[PDB]
Design a binder for this molecule. Structure first.
Ligand SMILES: *[C@@H]1O[C@H](CO)[C@@H](O)[C@H](O)[C@H]1NC(C)=O
Ligand SMILES: *[C@@H]1O[C@H](CO)[C@@H](O)[C@H](O)[C@H]1NC(C)=O
Lengths: 345, 248
């Protein structure tokens, strides 16, 4: 039981006696423990970095190494200690997620300029029979997230799920111009009444490249402490007004976070919004930005680095009075994916 | 008061003055000159909001009741009055609240009803819902009646939930003081100007109507919101503000 945390990526460690997650001090850690630690949370042939950092997480029962014993596992050699012997703790990056080219005026949800290429380097587009339908966001070269109600019945088998990345326009994704299918996991509790758990992972067989237009988005950490009116940046080719078809180019302007008690009150949405559903938009008149993509994500920028918080979901009439969009809640189950990404290899 | 003669000493000793400031003027420049008219505007003072009236301030009374102009050669007077025979008139100055059944306030014998917010509507306003639409609503269904002639209806939708198809959603929720979508309720909040009245108390849009007899669209006395009061009586004497304007 091991997990990332917060902005500076401290490994928390669960112990059965202390019943609690705990950090590890950097007393003689190695890439032969560290680069072999990303396969613990579903990263087989990738690694980025590890360093020592200052303790600020908030536990007073650390984890230490049993290097005095011989050749045992990592998971046996972890006892408790009250002090870090070098006062450096786990810092980690399991993949080259994060940065884009910090550009200026990408605002093409209605009334703006187009999404500049390479500045949203995780934006994909998913296709069946070469029509543009749903979006998503990459976290590994082999895994890809999207909204589950695209992969619902009777289209629930993987061989008709063709991903197509890269090109802002509706045309240039051709056959061969985009890697293709593999495994369709789902959170297996989607419903008709609630759309609780409208998030399904997808997998590819052929690992793509981090070249220019493609880069994995950062999946959030357990307990990363958002702000209750935070800015959020969505993207997608969606139709800016309803009863349309699709916008031609990539549109990537901004929205805001509404809290629960405004959405979930009596006038907006009469007590519907679950813990695995996050509201977003602006609770206002016709100022909202629709661009309906059903997976066209919600990307915030805390710790000066882009992080993923919500993938899209259902809504009401396109960007109008009282009716915001309601988003899937992808900090709730960032470990369910990490126990459904552990055993593909 | 125009085309007459006056002075100050018989005035300010015949009314029980407590202060007489001035602005854009010197207090002895009254005693000589010859103006063109004088425009005295008086009203009573609610006690706990007396400090609204500082010359060129924010607050309630200078913003949504009577904006004291800070440009002309005005001179402000704060006087008193014995409460033997004093009957504060408390009447509402707006047309479109007495058109929709504003009768009166219930305050005491000596309480003055000031204002907090002052919302302005158009001429075709009608604060009741549409009754020939509302019957097929089930959820959040409001009261309604028939509007008078030309007054366009309130915009009410029967838009679709996740399962329920005819659930009511109109504008102006919950109350126009704290609406969620301010760019869509017809009652627009405006600040009062120099020499204007407060153009209307706000109507809560969901106490205006009934169910069976959709008559001419009226409202209900609890629904007018945005006013409070206090008592004018201090030192056994109902205090009173009064402005002067020495134009020309
Ligand atoms: C109050 O009214 C009575 C009769 O209406 C009058 O005789 C009396 O003079 C008034 N009070 C004062 C102080 O003038
Ligand atoms: C104000 O008047 C109404 C009607 O006369 C009455 O119902 C209400 O009780 C009065 N207010 C108080 C505080 O008694």
């Amino acid at each position: 039981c091991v997990r990332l945390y917060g902005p500076n990526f401290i490994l928390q460690v669960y112990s059965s006696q202390r019943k609690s997650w705990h950090p590890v001090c950097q007393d003689d850690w190695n890439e032969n423990y560290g680069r072999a630690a990303c396969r613990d949370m579903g990263y087989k042939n990738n690694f980025y970095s590890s360093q020592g950092i200052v303790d600020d997480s908030g536990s007073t029962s650390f984890m230490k190494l049993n290097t005095s014993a011989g050749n045992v596992d990592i998971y046996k050699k972890l006892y408790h200690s009250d002090a870090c012997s070098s006062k450096a703790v786990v810092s980690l990056r399991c993949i080259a997620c994060g940065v884009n080219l910090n550009s200026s005026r990408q605002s093409q949800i209605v009334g703006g300029e187009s999404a500049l290429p390479g500045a949203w380097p995780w934006q994909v587009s998913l296709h069946v029979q070469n029509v543009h339908v749903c979006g998503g966001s990459i976290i590994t070269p082999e895994w890809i997230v999207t909204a589950a109600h695209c992969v619902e019945k009777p289209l629930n088998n993987p061989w008709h799920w063709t991903a197509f990345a890269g090109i802002l326009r509706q045309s240039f994704m051709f056959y061969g111009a985009g890697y293709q299918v593999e495994k369709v996991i789902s959170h297996p509790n989607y419903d008709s009444k609630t759309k609780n758990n409208d998030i399904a992972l997808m997998k590819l067989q052929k690992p793509l490249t981090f070249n220019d237009l493609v880069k994995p988005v950062c999946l959030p950490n357990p307990g990363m402490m958002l702000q209750p009116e935070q800015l959020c940046w969505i993207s997608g080719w969606g139709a800016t007004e309803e009863k349309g078809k699709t916008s031609e180019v990539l549109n990537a302007a901004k929205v805001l976070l509404i809290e629960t008690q405004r959405c979930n009150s009596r006038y907006v949405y009469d007590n519907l919004i679950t813990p695995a559903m996050i509201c977003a938009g602006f609770l206002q008149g016709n100022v909202d930005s629709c661009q309906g993509d059903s997976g066209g994500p919600l990307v915030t920028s805390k710790n000066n680095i882009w992080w993923l918080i919500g993938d899209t979901s259902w809504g009401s009439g396109c960007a109008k009075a009282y009716r915001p969009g309601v988003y899937g809640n992808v900090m709730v189950f960032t470990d369910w994916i990490y126990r459904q990404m552990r055993a593909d290899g | 008061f125009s085309n007459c003669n006056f002075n100050l000493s018989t005035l300010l000793r015949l009314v029980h003055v407590d202060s007489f400031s001035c602005n854009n003027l010197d207090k002895s420049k009254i005693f000589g000159s010859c103006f063109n008219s004088i425009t005295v505007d008086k009203f009573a003072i609610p006690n706990r909001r007396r400090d609204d009236l500082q010359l060129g301030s924010s607050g309630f009374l200078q913003s949504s009741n009577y904006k004291i102009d800070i440009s002309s050669s005005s001179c402000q007077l704060y006087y008193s009055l014995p409460l033997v025979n004093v009957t504060i008139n408390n009447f509402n100055p707006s047309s479109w609240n007495r058109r929709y059944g504003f009768g009166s306030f219930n305050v005491s014998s000596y309480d003055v009803v000031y204002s907090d917010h002052c919302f302005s509507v158009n001429s075709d306003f009608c604060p009741c819902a549409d009754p020939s639409v509302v019957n097929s609503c089930v959820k959040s269904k409001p009261l309604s009646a028939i509007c008078p002639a030309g007054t366009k209806y309130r915009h009410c939708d029967l838009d679709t939930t996740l399962y329920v198809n005819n659930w009511c959603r109109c504008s102006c929720l919950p109350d126009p003081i704290s609406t969620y979508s301010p760019n869509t309720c017809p009652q627009k909040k405006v600040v009062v100007g120099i020499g204007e009245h407060c153009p209307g108390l706000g109507i809560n849009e969901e106490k205006c109507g009934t169910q069976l007899n959709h008559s001419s669209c009226s409202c209900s006395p609890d629904a007018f919101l945005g006013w409070s009061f206090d008592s004018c009586i201090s030192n056994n004497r109902c205090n009173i503000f009064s402005n002067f304007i020495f134009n020309g």
